[PDB]
C-alpha cells in the first residue's frame, strides 16, 4: 500500500515563518514520517512558504487571521481572494491525482468542503476548541465522516462537544534534529511560544525574578507593548528575547536551559515546545493544562503545578535537581518518534482510503 | 425536454417578508414562468419563507446581512450555522435529483461552490457590482462556467469587470396580478423601495413638497430615524407610509398614482418597481441610472432625468399629462411577460443542461 497524499497547510502564514505556530512543525514531520514509510507527499501552502521535506506548491492569496485572536466567535470571516480559498480550489482541481487529502487548517472552510470532495479528507485539529463555530463544524463533519478528524491528546478532544468521536493520534518529532544536553553551562529558564497575553509569560517572568534565574523567551512578538509591559512589570528579571528561530537554532539554545516553563491560561491541546524540550534533555514545568498533564510525568520528567500558581512554579524550579535530564530524552525517544507516529498515521489513512466508498 | 429544477433563494430573509428585496419576486415569477412551460421547480429558502407557486423546502439557520449594507467590502462574513451554508449543504445532498440548480443569492459562497458540484448551476445576479469580492467571484466563476451567470440589463452587466461575459436575460412579471388604472382618483406620486439613505427618498419628498402632490412611500423601513429625518426635513410634504405590502395590495394602491418616482444614487441594475408601475398604468419618472434608462421610454412611458436633479424631477411631474398611461401598460405586456421571459430562461437552461459535460 503506497499512497499519494496532498497536505494542505495553515493559511495563517507561510511555512517557516512561525506565524503559523506549532502546526508548521507537525505538518512537516507528518510529511517526513509518511515519506519514511514510502509515501508521496505534496504540500500546498501560502506563497512564501519554505520546506526541504518534499514538493511544495505555493498558492497566492490573502493571509488569514489566527483563530487565537477570535476566541468564542460566532462568525466566519474570509478576506477577499483568501489563500485558504485558493488552496482548496487548487485541491479541488488536483484531487483525482491523490489518494487522500490531509488538512491542517483550523478553519470553517475545509471542514465545510469535506463532503463536496470525492476523495477521503483527513483533518488534523491542532488546538482545543476555541469557538462555537469550529466546535459546531467539527461535530457536523465527524458525523458525516467518522474517524476522519484527529487531535493530539484526549485532553484536546475533551474541549469539543463531540470529542468522543475524534481520533487521538499522538505526536512525533524528528529526534535526529535535537542534541541531548546533560549539564547546561549556566542555570537558566526557557519559555517557548507566541508572546500574547493568554500565554501567561507574566508568570514565567515572575518565577525568573523570584529564583534569580535568567529567562530566555523563544517566540514571535505579536504585541510590541505587551513585551514592554512584561519587562516593565518585572524589571529585576533578566529576560532575553531570542526571536523566532529554526528548529536547529532553537534546540541549540533550548538545551542550555535548566527547565522549560509553560504557563497556559487556556487549555493547551498539546505542547510541541514541551516535546522538543524533552528531546534536548530539558525538564518541563507546566500548569495542569490540557495535554501537558499527559506529557509531563510529575517528578520524573518535570512538574505539574496548579493552574496559575506562581508560587508553585517557583517551588518546582527549586526542585529541578531531582529530575534526571536523561529520563526526559528517553521518554521522547520511546513516544513522540516519527517511526511510531508515522505508523499510527499510516494505519489511519490506510483505513480511510480503504473504506471511503 | 422537461426538467427538474432546484431554485436556491436569498439568505437575507424569508420569502414573502420583503427583507430580501426585489429578488423575492423575480424568483417566484421565474418559478411560475418555467412551470408554465411544464418544468418542476423546488424552492429552497430560509425558515419562515412562504409561497403558493410550488414546493418550498425551508432550511433553518442564521439570516445573512444584505450586501447593500456592505458596499465596497473586501471581506466575506458568514454567521455561525448560516442559512446560506445550510441551503447549499441541502443542495449538495439532493443535487442528483435535479437537472440544474438556479441560484439567486448575491453571495460569495454559491459562486465558490459552483465547480464543487456535479450538476449545472445557473446564477441570477440581481444587483449591480456592489463589492470587489462579488465582482472578483463573478469573474472567476464565469471563466469556469461560461454563460452560467445572468443579469437583468446590460447596464447591470457593465458594472462588473467582466460583464461582457454575462448573459442578459431581461425580466418578466405575472401581468394577471396587475389591474390597469386609467384615471387615479386623486393625483399623487409613488415611491417603491427600501427606506435607506442611498435610495434617494429625500429627492422624491422634495419633489412632492414642490408640486403639492402627496407622496405614498412603499417599502420597508430599515432606519427608523432616517424616516423621521425625511419627514422633519420636508414637513410641508404630505407623505404616507404604506408599509410593505403584498403584490396584490401593492398594485391596488400603486395604480392610484399619477407616476412613480425613482431616485437611485447608485447604479440600479433593474427596476422591478418600475415594471410593476407600468403594469398598473403608472408612468415612471427616474434618474438616468442603470437599467432604468432602458426601462423608461422618455416621453412615451415616463421621463429620464439627470442624476440627482430635483428640479428635473419637478419639471417631469408637471409634464405627466403628456404620458398615455396605456402606453406604459402595453410596453409591459409586450416585454416583461412571463411567456417571453420563461422562453428565454428555458432555452438558456436547456443549453446549460445539454452542454454541461
Ligand atoms: O524560536 C522559536 C522557534 C520555533 N518555535 C516553535 O513554536 C511551536 C510551539 O508549539 P506548541 O504546540 O508548544 O504551542 P503553540 O505556541 O503553537 O500554541 C513549536 O513547534 C516550536 O518549534 C518557537 O516557539 N520559538
Ligand atoms: O410595499 C411594497 C411591496 C412589495 N415591494 C416589492 O419591492 C421590490 C422592489 O424591487 P426593485 O428591483 O425595483 O429595487 P430594490 O428595492 O429591490 O433595490 C419589488 O419587487 C416590489 O414588488 C415594495 O417595494 N414595497
XYZ file of N, CA and C and ligand atoms in Angstrom, chain B residues 21-22 25 68 192-194 199 218-219 243-245 250 262 268 270-274 276, ligand 2:
91
model
N -35.933 41.970 -0.597
C -35.995 42.897 -1.710
C -36.662 42.315 -2.947
N -36.288 42.881 -4.097
C -36.928 42.528 -5.351
C -36.672 41.111 -5.819
N -39.501 38.476 -5.650
C -40.490 38.402 -6.717
C -39.935 37.818 -8.006
N -26.172 45.297 0.390
C -26.310 46.739 0.244
C -25.773 47.496 1.451
N -41.307 53.400 -4.359
C -41.314 51.981 -4.030
C -39.872 51.523 -3.887
N -39.474 51.174 -2.660
C -38.152 50.608 -2.406
C -37.863 50.519 -0.911
N -36.658 50.072 -0.552
C -36.257 50.020 0.848
C -35.809 51.395 1.328
N -31.202 55.296 -1.333
C -32.345 55.193 -2.226
C -32.826 56.546 -2.730
N -43.797 53.185 -0.581
C -43.934 51.738 -0.466
C -42.567 51.128 -0.182
N -42.459 50.408 0.921
C -41.218 49.735 1.239
C -41.114 49.472 2.723
N -46.164 50.933 4.447
C -45.550 49.691 4.856
C -45.150 48.871 3.639
N -44.875 47.595 3.900
C -44.535 46.636 2.857
C -45.740 45.742 2.602
N -46.189 45.696 1.356
C -47.464 45.091 1.012
C -47.243 43.841 0.176
N -50.192 45.905 -3.201
C -49.315 46.935 -3.747
C -49.851 47.476 -5.068
N -38.406 57.372 -9.105
C -37.259 56.552 -8.747
C -36.021 57.434 -8.708
N -28.768 51.441 -10.388
C -29.820 50.442 -10.263
C -29.698 49.431 -11.400
N -31.852 46.956 -12.180
C -33.144 46.856 -12.837
C -34.222 47.316 -11.864
N -35.285 47.888 -12.422
C -36.382 48.411 -11.634
C -37.596 47.513 -11.656
N -37.649 46.579 -10.705
C -38.835 45.748 -10.551
C -40.054 46.604 -10.230
N -39.893 47.587 -9.345
C -40.991 48.502 -9.068
C -41.418 49.257 -10.320
N -40.477 49.543 -11.221
C -40.810 50.259 -12.449
C -41.731 49.434 -13.336
N -43.670 46.942 -12.455
C -44.972 46.804 -11.809
C -45.792 48.081 -11.965
O -44.931 47.539 -0.268
C -44.167 47.048 -1.022
C -44.464 45.674 -1.507
C -43.570 44.967 -2.458
N -42.402 45.670 -2.907
C -41.534 44.999 -3.812
O -40.061 45.574 -3.601
C -39.351 45.230 -4.911
C -38.528 46.391 -5.478
O -37.523 45.874 -6.330
P -36.598 46.839 -7.336
O -35.790 45.988 -8.303
O -37.444 47.853 -8.101
O -35.479 47.684 -6.472
P -34.939 47.192 -4.998
O -35.792 47.910 -3.956
O -35.098 45.685 -4.864
O -33.468 47.565 -4.887
C -40.354 44.961 -5.814
O -40.386 43.607 -6.251
C -41.793 45.261 -5.092
O -42.858 44.385 -5.543
C -42.089 47.046 -2.417
O -41.122 47.629 -2.773
N -42.984 47.744 -1.469
